[PDB]
Design a protein around this ligand. Structure first.
Ligand SMILES: *[C@@H]1O[C@H](CO)[C@@H](O[C@@H]2O[C@H](CO)[C@@H](O[C@@H]3O[C@H](CO[C@H]4O[C@H](CO[C@H]5O[C@H](CO)[C@@H](O)[C@H](O)[C@@H]5O)[C@@H](O)[C@H](O[C@H]5O[C@H](CO)[C@@H](O)[C@H](O)[C@@H]5O[C@H]5O[C@H](CO)[C@@H](O)[C@H](O)[C@@H]5O)[C@@H]4O)[C@@H](O)[C@H](O[C@H]4O[C@H](CO)[C@@H](O)[C@H](O)[C@@H]4O)[C@@H]3O)[C@H](O)[C@H]2NC(C)=O)[C@H](O)[C@H]1NC(C)=O
Ligand SMILES: *[C@@H]1O[C@H](CO)[C@@H](O[C@@H]2O[C@H](CO)[C@@H](O[C@@H]3O[C@H](CO[C@H]4O[C@H](CO[C@H]5O[C@H](CO)[C@@H](O)[C@H](O)[C@@H]5O)[C@@H](O)[C@H](O[C@H]5O[C@H](CO)[C@@H](O)[C@H](O)[C@@H]5O[C@H]5O[C@H](CO)[C@@H](O)[C@H](O)[C@@H]5O)[C@@H]4O)[C@@H](O)[C@H](O[C@H]4O[C@H](CO)[C@@H](O)[C@H](O)[C@@H]4O)[C@@H]3O)[C@H](O)[C@H]2NC(C)=O)[C@H](O)[C@H]1NC(C)=O
Ligand SMILES: *[C@@H]1O[C@H](CO)[C@@H](O[C@@H]2O[C@H](CO)[C@@H](O[C@@H]3O[C@H](CO[C@H]4O[C@H](CO[C@H]5O[C@H](CO)[C@@H](O)[C@H](O)[C@@H]5O)[C@@H](O)[C@H](O[C@H]5O[C@H](CO)[C@@H](O)[C@H](O)[C@@H]5O[C@H]5O[C@H](CO)[C@@H](O)[C@H](O)[C@@H]5O)[C@@H]4O)[C@@H](O)[C@H](O[C@H]4O[C@H](CO)[C@@H](O)[C@H](O)[C@@H]4O)[C@@H]3O)[C@H](O)[C@H]2NC(C)=O)[C@H](O)[C@H]1NC(C)=O
Ligand SMILES: *[C@@H]1O[C@H](CO)[C@@H](O[C@@H]2O[C@H](CO)[C@@H](O[C@@H]3O[C@H](CO[C@H]4O[C@H](CO)[C@@H](O)[C@H](O[C@H]5O[C@H](CO)[C@@H](O)[C@H](O)[C@@H]5O)[C@@H]4O)[C@@H](O)[C@H](O[C@H]4O[C@H](CO)[C@@H](O)[C@H](O)[C@@H]4O)[C@@H]3O)[C@H](O)[C@H]2NC(C)=O)[C@H](O)[C@H]1NC(C)=O
Ligand SMILES: *[C@@H]1O[C@H](CO)[C@@H](O[C@@H]2O[C@H](CO)[C@@H](O[C@@H]3O[C@H](CO[C@H]4O[C@H](CO)[C@@H](O)[C@H](O[C@H]5O[C@H](CO)[C@@H](O)[C@H](O)[C@@H]5O)[C@@H]4O)[C@@H](O)[C@H](O[C@H]4O[C@H](CO)[C@@H](O)[C@H](O)[C@@H]4O)[C@@H]3O)[C@H](O)[C@H]2NC(C)=O)[C@H](O)[C@H]1NC(C)=O
Ligand SMILES: *[C@@H]1O[C@H](CO)[C@@H](O[C@@H]2O[C@H](CO)[C@@H](O[C@@H]3O[C@H](CO[C@H]4O[C@H](CO)[C@@H](O)[C@H](O)[C@@H]4O)[C@@H](O)[C@H](O)[C@@H]3O)[C@H](O)[C@H]2NC(C)=O)[C@H](O)[C@H]1NC(C)=O
Ligand SMILES: CCCCCCCCCCCCCCCCCCCC(=O)O[C@H](COC(=O)CCCCCCCCCCCCCC)COP(=O)(O)OCCN
Ligand SMILES: CCCCCCCCCCCCCCCCCCCC(=O)O[C@H](COC(=O)CCCCCCCCCCCCCC)COP(=O)(O)OCCN
Ligand SMILES: *[C@@H]1O[C@H](CO)[C@@H](O[C@@H]2O[C@H](CO)[C@@H](O)[C@H](O)[C@H]2NC(C)=O)[C@H](O)[C@H]1NC(C)=O
Ligand SMILES: *[C@@H]1O[C@H](CO)[C@@H](O[C@@H]2O[C@H](CO)[C@@H](O)[C@H](O)[C@H]2NC(C)=O)[C@H](O)[C@H]1NC(C)=O
Lengths: 191, 23, 58, 92, 23, 50
């Protein structure tokens, strides 16, 4: 299962034996982001705006803690866009799924998020964020052509293109009327 | 007169371990 | 008069070429942006394995 | 009437696309099978032709010619504008 | 396993005065 | 259904809470957004910009 969340994300659970369980979108006290971890400190300090205390020395007894098997997991490239356009917690793969089945799963859905006359700049900015890891040269270009339609002047070019997009059916109609005149006017020159 | 505050080094040890499968 | 008649002709040609280029620039942008989106969808995605040691930053 | 007018707009907008025509055509068949079995068997055939025959080269070819549509029109328009002028510049 | 060393702030006060003419 | 007149009560010291008031601006087409999801969906925050 995948689910979209708000940035910045911070979760710190104090454990009973005196360690702390941390999952956080940003670094603090040398703890890496995005991967969770069990954290212990030798001297009281403030991390993620709260106090992580040094635990009381304990006596060792025979353990019964479980040790689960490790597991690599491959996710779809655009998992973030799939989770965002559902607005609920959604199933994205299985532990033991093939590359082919995994891909043919949100492909039709994703293809039909096509370019529109009404949010071309907002679309072009998604395409860049999607392309950045694949082709960084193209991303930087797309991002540029994004900010040109949005920012340059008062966004007048964005406006102009948006409007010329919505007019398409009228233009064809006129274009057709011109041909029907031109053909007649031409045929009415030949002897 | 000139009062100043010089920084002086220090450190706190921080151990970290993994949680297979996130369980 | 001849200069004004010539100016009108030259203006119309540059005005025609101006449009026929804009038609080609927009048409090429729609084709390339839509293909890249298709390729973005089918790329291999990230891998996660819950290893902390791997993500250490010094 | 009420039951039908409930997912109709939603369902209509699952339209044919340049990027999964074979995968779409295979859905249409599964949808048509109980209604018109003769048509289903046909659609299923034209499905496997774009996917299987050769190395799917025809699927590829059609997918590509689909995405090129805007360029082709643009060129087509430039040809007319030449043809008209070249024709008008033959008439005495 | 991953052992780390986090820096923690501190300071030492340092007063300074002048020597007119360098005498 | 029947809305009955209540029995007279004796007044005692209250501990009822009094929450702050709050204006809330919704999107113009909130009804169409809620309809095409077919589930309970998040539409804004208390303190969001236009
Ligand atoms: C509060 O509570 C929490 C718990 O909730 C405390 O956190 C826990 O603290 C424990 C310490 O008491 C930690 O245990 C220690 O884990 C160390 C790391 O283990 C992993 O790496 C091992 C080595 O891997 C490398 O080297 C080998 C070759 O040697 C290579 O093959 C590898 O590729 C690596 O290069 C590895 O052996 C371990 O593998 C075992 O676990 C994983 C799952 O985690 C399994 O997939 C494996 O199959 C394997 O488990 C099986 O096999 C082993 C034997 O091989 C059995 O023991 C198991 O029962 C099972 O059958 C890991 O990948 C260990 O190095 C460390 O070892 C010490 O102890 C042993 C004796 O037990 C000695 O021989 C060693 O010399 C060493 O002293 C120890 O086990 C827990 O990980 C940690 N738990 C969590 C969830 O984080 C926390 O401390 C508490 N806080 C306070 C304040 O009290
Ligand atoms: C080890 O030993 C060493 C010595 O070997 C120790 O170092 C010595 O430590 C002393 C502290 O005990 C220091 O004395 C202190 O100096 C301070 C700075 O003095 C200068 O600035 C003054 C203010 O200047 C500004 O403001 C005025 C207006 O108020 C303006 O006019 C200016 O433009 C500035 O904006 C200023 O008054 C002083 O002027 C005096 O000295 C200079 C030469 O240095 C002369 O040119 C001046 O004419 C003038 O001297 C005459 O006039 C004054 C009165 O005005 C008389 O006192 C003199 O005897 C003389 O006639 C400097 O330019 C002071 O602020 C500080 O004042 C404290 O004490 C007074 C009382 O004495 C209080 O009233 C104050 O409120 C304040 O508490 C003090 O005098 C020594 O400088 C320093 N010596 C050296 C060489 O560095 C060291 O600490 C020891 N270490 C250990 C571990 O023990
Ligand atoms: C069954 O149970 C239910 C409860 O579950 C019963 O319903 C409850 O019945 C209560 C009566 O016992 C009602 O209380 C009454 O509310 C009246 C209206 O209060 C609002 O308007 C006030 C006036 O607003 C105008 O005028 C002012 C200037 O005077 C202007 O500033 C305004 O702009 C308006 O023009 C206003 O003062 C109130 O404001 C307070 O509450 C709101 C939230 O509701 C807060 O946002 C405010 O900050 C403020 O609360 C704080 O400040 C006040 C003091 O100013 C404190 O009292 C609070 O603790 C808090 O710190 C409202 O906007 C009141 O007029 C009425 O006042 C009577 O009592 C007071 C003494 O307490 C006298 O001085 C008055 O003269 C007057 O007699 C009273 O409080 C409950 O509203 C109602 N609850 C609900 C949820 O509906 C029900 O009856 C029961 N049924 C049966 C059968 O038993
Ligand atoms: C669960 O585990 C499975 C199995 O590991 C994961 O799926 C596999 O992912 C790996 C890594 O991404 C893929 O590796 C690539 O393999 C191709 C060659 O594939 C061909 O040959 C295979 C021979 O065994 C065969 O299995 C393949 O068959 C599948 O694909 C065909 C065609 O779509 C399909 O019809 C079949 O039904 C199968 O689905 C196929 O014939 C190879 O070209 C790749 O090379 C790249 O990487 C290497 C190493 O970095 C590099 O050296 C090269 O230069 C190149 O960059 C790569 O090795 C593998 O294809 C996947 N296998 C399957 C069956 O899908 C899966 O991801 C895991 N799931 C989860 C959820 O984690
Ligand atoms: C939470 O609270 C906020 C703050 O009140 C609400 O957002 C505001 O809503 C009001 C009412 O709908 C908006 O009022 C209008 O303001 C414009 C002028 O806006 C410009 O100047 C502002 C100066 O302070 C500035 O804040 C604005 O900046 C925002 O917008 C720009 C451009 O998009 C953006 O880049 C910025 O990042 C900001 O987001 C902006 O520069 C004014 O023209 C309007 O006038 C109309 O109404 C009046 C009164 O009826 C009338 O007299 C006029 O004739 C005209 O009809 C109007 O006053 C305000 O813009 C909103 N502010 C922001 C920051 O968005 C929000 O709705 C509340 N949320 C919820 C969930 O309830
Ligand atoms: C973070 O992980 C560290 C491991 O990298 C932890 O360090 C270990 O902590 C134990 C606490 O019991 C130390 O044990 C002490 O050892 C000293 C003497 O040291 C010698 O003997 C020990 C075995 O007893 C041996 O491991 C050493 O190599 C030495 O030969 C005793 O005086 C104490 O009483 C106690 O037994 C380990 O020595 C220490 N290991 C290492 C490699 O440093 C550290 O505690 C963890 N920190 C936090 C914040 O949890
Ligand atoms: C006041 C300012 C000055 C005026 C400037 C304008 C002057 C014009 C002169 C006259 C010529 C008119 C030309 C007509 C253009 C009409 C635009 C058509 C847009 C259109 O229909 O496209 C749709 C939406 O895309 C869009 O609408 C996106 C359009 C492209 C946006 C990007 C523009 C920047 C191009 C950068 C070029 C460099 C890149 C590298 C080559 C999608 O197409 P579809 O409808 O077929 O449906 C396909 C499936 N959805
Ligand atoms: C190397 C191999 C050899 C090369 C072969 C090709 C040679 C071609 C020679 C030059 C001629 C070029 C012809 C241009 C074709 C362009 C294709 C346009 C496709 C297109 O835009 O259609 C869109 C997607 O459908 C599609 O893209 C689906 C297209 C149709 C797929 C089915 C093909 C099999 C037909 C079977 C015939 C027998 C059936 C019974 C009659 C949808 O249309 P829209 O964009 O208007 O939007 C409508 C609302 N979404
Ligand atoms: C916690 O661990 C730190 C490791 O940074 C200890 O720091 C050492 O402290 C001694 C003084 O006893 C210094 O001589 C060393 O140079 C420090 N080691 C470093 C910076 O690597 C610290 O003593 C420990 N604190 C407690 C309370 O045990
Ligand atoms: C020397 O002066 C420094 C000034 O940097 C003192 O540092 C302060 O120490 C306290 C702890 O008592 C901290 O809470 C403060 O934040 C520090 N102040 C800073 C960094 O400005 C230091 O305590 C002094 N040392 C001695 C031995 O007196």
């Amino acid at each position: 299962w995948a689910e979209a969340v708000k940035e910045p994300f911070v979760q710190v659970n104090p454990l009973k034996n005196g360690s702390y369980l941390v999952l956080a979108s940003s670094t603090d006290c040398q703890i890496p982001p995005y991967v969770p971890s069990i954290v212990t400190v030798n001297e009281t300090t403030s991390c993620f705006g709260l106090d992580f205390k040094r635990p009381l020395v304990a006596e060792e007894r025979l353990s019964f803690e479980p040790r689960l098997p490790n597991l690599q997991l491959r996710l779809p490239h655009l998992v973030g866009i799939i989770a965002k356009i559902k607005g609920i917690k959604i199933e994205v793969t299985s532990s033991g799924e093939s590359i082919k089945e995994q891909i043919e799963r949100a492909k039709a859905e994703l293809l039909r998020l096509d370019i529109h006359e009404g949010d071309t700049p907002a679309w072009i900015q998604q395409l860049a964020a999607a392309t950045k890891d694949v082709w960084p040269a193209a991303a930087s270009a797309l991002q540029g052509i994004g900010n040109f339609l949005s920012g340059t002047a008062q966004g007048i070019f964005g406006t102009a293109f948006s409007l010329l997009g919505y007019l398409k059916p009228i233009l064809i109609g006129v274009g057709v009327i011109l041909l029907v005149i031109l053909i007649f006017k031409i045929v009415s020159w030949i002897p | 007169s000139l009062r100043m505050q010089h920084p002086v080094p220090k450190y706190v040890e921080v151990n970290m371990t993994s949680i297979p499968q996130g369980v | 008069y001849t200069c004004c008649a010539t100016s009108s002709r030259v203006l119309a040609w540059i005005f025609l070429v101006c449009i026929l280029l804009i038609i080609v620039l927009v048409s090429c942008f729609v084709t390339i942006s839509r293909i890249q989106w298709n390729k973005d969808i089918q790329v291999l995605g990230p891998v996660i394995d819950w290893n902390v040691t791997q993500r250490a930053v010094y």
